[PDB]
Design a protein around this nucleic acid. Structure first.
Lengths: 95, 84, 89, 105, 106, 89, 83, 93
DNA sequence: CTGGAGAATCCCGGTGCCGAGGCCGCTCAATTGGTCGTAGACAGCTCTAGCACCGCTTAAACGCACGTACGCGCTGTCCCCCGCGTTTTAACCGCCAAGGGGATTACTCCCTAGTCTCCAGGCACGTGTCAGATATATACATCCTGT
DNA sequence: ACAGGATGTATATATCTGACACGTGCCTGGAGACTAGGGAGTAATCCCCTTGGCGGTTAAAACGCGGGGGACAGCGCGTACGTGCGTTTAAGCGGTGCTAGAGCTGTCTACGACCAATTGAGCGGCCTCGGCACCGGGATTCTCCAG
């Protein structure tokens, strides 16, 4: 078979997905997660798809920036694989 | 009978999707605990912000969350988004 | 400052306890600070919801935004009793 | 015989003061009647929350007079209030006795 | 009698009326000084012109005439004073500036 | 929205350049957001020094507090120049 | 009168003691100068903003309340000096 | 006489146990006036304003170094470095 | 470590769509021109506290001498996630189909600002006293030094 | 690692002072009650678009088959910061000296809120087409198995 080298696919996605801006989580399952968690609060809630698309935009963008700071912490901790406790530090500093 | 009766939709956020999002965030190498931990942290954040959004919604006594609800909710924690 | 009111409530919680003036000042900025947070967020609540009236419904929403969980629920309790006695007085 | 809105609502905190700052604080065209009562209730409840814990702090240091230290301990020891007020600075308060575990011997 | 728009008095296109109206209706002070809408709208228009010019140029950098959010992102975040002004807001459909740490580059 | 004004300034700066709808919405949110920020700081400026009117003084001080360096200074230059023109016009 | 060497007024022992109050266990020699530089710029920002408030108010005397307002501007409210 | 490390731990205990300010009032006040020189002529200062500046200054250092310490301890070391402070400056903005 | 081979995207050439941009009514938001009450700069003068001055001790900062104790690189280990194609489903995409509920108008309540008056709760400000600052000696806690 | 000596720090006890607590003089901020104007809820309606249904294609998730690579520990070197005590300084102690300028009171002026009337710029909807997605293929660009 044909195989790319370890790390190349990462950077190719870095430059590509930094050039593009579309949402990467599956639309319908994430939207149903929103609806499902939302079920417990008010009866017969209906959700606009595009509003959830905006929710995914802010959500994924939020995760993106939070992972950027987490990554600066890992590199700051002289490592290249971020770990959960790094995110926990980020959340602690943020609040 | 393709009903979606409320189960494991947090697993919709999948491993290669988390990896690709991280690539857009610039993350280079990803541990296995990051994926489920990311699902949990994302769930917590959305529960907080969306919960406040629902509080706006019940004051408005509505059953459809509009985009402005999301805008006001994100602003309440200072995370205003441009373009809505 | 909130000298006499922190004094009266303090005497309700600990009748044999005093307080230094600087700590009372801390209480003054503390109450005024939280107060400013609540009034500002309530302003955003009324205006963002195209309303020009801040009531206990809007304040209730504000409490739900700022106070976490059970603290907010006991705020609902205290507000409920307080408003109750007031509406009966 | 007149009587304060606090005591008629069974409150200690000044309904008039909070209402006055709200009126002259430029927040809305009009402010509902339950808003000052409810807000004062929130303030009195929070004040009870801090004064109880602070009283305990005074008890631990064998004192009857509150100093800033008791306020710092009172706020920073209540996890919900501490987390809610984590970015607040108290003059002459110090910090919580809090040493990270690895720093301890 | 004939009238000339108060925006034109400063030779500006931005609405002195709308900004002035939103300031009055925004519950900030009891009275609004005469220099507040003209001066404030002038400063906001000035900053706006900076951002729009940079976005226009950046859009031209792909030989495209329609400005997209990505160039709003690239344009705003490469100016230190605006980046400091806008550090906690995120641009939808814009992405993030390319920023890969030196130790991460091959 | 601010659409036609972004269009006017856009044609004054780049007559042959257009803008996407989403970018126009972003600009609308930007102007409204930063507008609320600056007006808020001007309001608390009025609070601090016990002023009840937001004049050129408050706006200038608000810009000098909020905007860094060259943007702030030249913003005062353009604004102040414009106000002088307003005294003329 | 021209004041000089006031960067030394934030003394190194004070920096160590504060670091102990801050929980620092070991303190590099680079920490002290890093503290004077970063802390200096920060304090310049806060005090600078306070002076901007003073220049607005047409006053010649900076009050403690002015410092309080300056701290609130950066979201770093200080309790125990009024307000 | 103490061996290396004991007195530092004691300073942790006493100064985290006490609340007084650690900086001399007058040199700090002169620093305030000297930096203040450059903006308006004939400026006057309150002593208590200098006191509030000392309070804010020392407490800001204490809390900021606690967060710094969380970064250092997080980074598996026991000696803080300027880089941690730089990270604090970026994350806070 | 440089390099030719291969794949992806850009670019160069070729094709058409629809959203963007220009057009066309339609208000309403921005303008002027007053009027009215009041926010605030200013005039005059002050008295808190700000400037400015004096002298010795030692608190506090600083310097010197000593030892110990800290980051960090390297090599190595290993485990676990990367890489890729294939299979599989309902995501996606394209389409049919109802009516929930958002948004509006249509009414009317009822809800809160605003004022004047009034007065007692509460403010400023003095004064005594006991908590605490201070004094003084000591057991207990803690490190260390030998064991 | 094991424990008592020795010193710091809290503790016991005792006394002395000033800040804390309490008293008085005085008023002004809050409450009553009523007016007065007008914000927002409510009822019922219309109809957008979400929901609810089918159906085709395949995007994309999940799984299987390698094997490269990164967190992490040990370890060893080497460097540098704290502690101590004594010296030195100028802040501290405390004490001095008079009025600057901050704060108040009394002017007087000017301006923004507001209303009504005006009106042309801006708003929403409705076309119309070429920028750009799509398309296909070569140049460039980016990556990868080999000398």
């Amino acid at each position: 078979p044909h195989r790319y080298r370890p790390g190349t696919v990462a950077l190719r996605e870095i430059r590509r997905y930094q050039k593009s801006t579309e949402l990467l989580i599956r639309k319908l399952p994430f939207q149903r997660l929103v609806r499902e968690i939302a079920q417990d609060f008010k009866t017969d809630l209906r959700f606009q798809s595009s509003a959830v698309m905006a929710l995914q935009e802010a959500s994924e963008a939020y995760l993106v920036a939070l992972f950027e700071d987490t990554n600066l912490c890992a590199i700051h901790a002289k490592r290249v694989t971020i770990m959960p406790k790094d995110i926990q530090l980020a959340r602690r500093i943020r609040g | 009978r393709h009903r979606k009766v409320l189960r494991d939709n947090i697993q919709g956020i999948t491993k290669p999707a988390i990896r690709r999002l991280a690539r857009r965030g610039g993350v280079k190498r990803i541990s296995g605990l990051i994926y489920e931990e990311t699902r949990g942290v994302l769930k917590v954040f959305l529960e907080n912000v969306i919960r406040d959004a629902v509080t706006y919604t019940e004051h408005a006594k509505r059953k459809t969350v509009t985009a402005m609800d999301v805008v006001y909710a994100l602003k309440r924690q200072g995370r205003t988004l441009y373009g809505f | 400052s909130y000298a006499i009111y922190v004094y009266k409530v303090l005497k309700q919680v600990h009748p044999d306890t005093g307080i230094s003036s600087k700590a009372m000042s801390i209480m003054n900025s503390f109450v005024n600070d939280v107060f400013e947070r609540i009034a500002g967020e309530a302003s955003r609540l009324a205006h963002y919801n195209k309303r020009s009236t801040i009531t206990s419904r809007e304040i209730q929403t504000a409490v739900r935004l700022l106070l976490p969980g059970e603290l907010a629920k006991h705020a609902v309790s205290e507000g409920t009793k307080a408003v109750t006695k007031y509406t009966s007085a | 015989k007149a009587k304060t809105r606090s005591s008629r609502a069974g409150l200690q905190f000044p309904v008039g003061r909070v209402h006055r700052l709200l009126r002259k604080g430029n927040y809305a065209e009009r402010v509902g009647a339950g808003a000052p009562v409810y807000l004062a209730a929130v303030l009195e409840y929070l004040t009870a929350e801090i004064l109880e814990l602070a009283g305990n702090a005074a008890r631990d240091n064998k004192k009857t007079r509150i100093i800033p230290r008791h306020l710092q301990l009172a706020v920073r020891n209540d996890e919900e209030l501490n987390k809610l007020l984590g970015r607040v600075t108290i003059a002459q308060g110090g910090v919580l006795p809090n040493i990270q575990s690895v720093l301890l011997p």
